[PDB]
Design a protein around this ligand. Structure first.
Ligand SMILES: Nc1nc2c(ncn2[C@@H]2O[C@H](COP(=O)(O)OP(=O)(O)O)[C@@H](O)[C@H]2O)c(=O)[nH]1
Ligand SMILES: Nc1nc2c(ncn2[C@@H]2O[C@H](COP(=O)(O)OP(=O)(O)O)[C@@H](O)[C@H]2O)c(=O)[nH]1
Lengths: 218, 212
């Protein structure tokens, strides 16, 4: 089994902790690989304060790096050996503070949303309150469906009402002890299985192809 | 009694709630009496990105107030002057970090001598006592490293709170630093703030402007 998981948030969002918080390890653009026959590439972005303005392109050009390299492989003389470097998922961390969606977020998402599968986790929810959380999410989704964005949507089914229970709110735990108050488990389930295979499916089918038709003007 | 209090943090930091919590780009001002307080809210910081520059907006507002005050003090008949100057800036550090976000370090070390910085540590219902501890110490290390001036409490009771700073907040003084502020909040204690503003910052401005 392989996986390539990209994490994206501004610093100090407790992501790099939460990763281990499912996967119980580490405290490691950048990539840290987990096996324990079963592989995960992990992708950390160092960047995302100061101006903050352009960069997103760094992410982009890395994605389309992986794509164009994969294509230029698929058309190669003897197609044989190709390993898959493409990025199935980007787990993305929204600032837990807000009344809304910070323009930085709205910009990155609507920028890269069709170049990868966005899983907008809501960060560090030990900040928030059930009502606060509620109004928050709804405010988000309103912000998106207003801004007309595509985040990868879970097809099959159990996952029926979690279309509604999204966006997703999180807590870092290696802490000595939980899906109750958090959305943690309700991810970890959807993490392990089988939903990755669906993710790779949507990446390779949807995003990649659109890239491939795209590049071809000549 | 009068006061002018400036609040500064990126949006969604729960400041504008905390203000009431004691009291029950652009720059701009609310005001109140309940004994006057002008309050000063900054719309911009946070959001943006690009925020490459801003902070000058704050500056030019400060030195607006100053230069207007001076140009008053030298006026034909000096008589009537009201004081618009800013005694205090309560400043909110991002509760998340392992450290001090470059945005902060830039604003502070930018305006630290143009006003009295009171760097509250934001929304501490985020944090943990150990987390909070290492956080503060990390901050102070960041400052004394970056050699910054935040207004320092004279007198005295406030003896060990020089140590108990930086200051951590909730929108109860037990777990929070809330009360340990509210006490130190203006009362007679503002009088020291106005003192340092008008004595220290203002004057330095006044000598400054005078090259000609
Ligand atoms: N409020 C909150 N804080 C957390 C959480 N997880 C970790 N932290 C704290 O936030 C700090 C930064 O977390 P980290 O994993 O380094 O996030 P990252 O720097 O964005 O990758 C850590 O020192 C943790 O103590 C969480 O779920 N909620
Ligand atoms: N966990 C936590 N949440 C807070 C706190 N203060 C405010 N909030 C929540 O976060 C949001 C920010 O509050 P607000 O005063 O509007 O922040 P501001 O815009 O920066 O002044 C509000 O909707 C509150 O529900 C706090 O001290 N702790």
């Amino acid at each position: 089994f392989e996986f390539t998981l990209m994490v994206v948030g501004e610093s100090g969002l407790g992501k790099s902790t939460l990763i281990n918080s499912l996967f119980l390890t580490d405290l490691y653009v950048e990539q840290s690989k987990v096996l324990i026959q079963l592989l995960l590439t992990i992708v950390d972005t160092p960047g995302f304060a100061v101006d903050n303005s352009n960069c997103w392109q760094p992410v982009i050009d890395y994605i389309d790096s992986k794509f164009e390299d994969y294509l230029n492989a698929e058309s190669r003389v003897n197609r044989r050996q190709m390993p898959d470097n493409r990025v199935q998922c980007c787990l993305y961390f929204i600032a837990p503070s807000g009344h809304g969606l910070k323009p930085l977020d709205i910009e990155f998402m609507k920028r890269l949303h069709e170049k990868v599968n966005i899983i907008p986790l809501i960060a560090k929810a030990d900040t928030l309150t059930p009502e606060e959380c509620q109004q928050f999410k709804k405010q988000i989704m309103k912000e998106i469906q207003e801004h007309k964005i595509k985040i990868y949507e879970f097809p099959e089914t159990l996952v029926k009402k979690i279309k509604d229970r999204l966006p997703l709110a999180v807590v870092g735990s290696n802490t000595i002890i939980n899906g109750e108050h958090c959305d943690f488990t309700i991810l970890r389930n959807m993490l392990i299985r089988t939903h990755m295979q669906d993710l790779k499916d949507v990446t390779n089918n949807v995003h990649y192809e659109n890239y491939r038709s795209r590049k071809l003007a000549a």
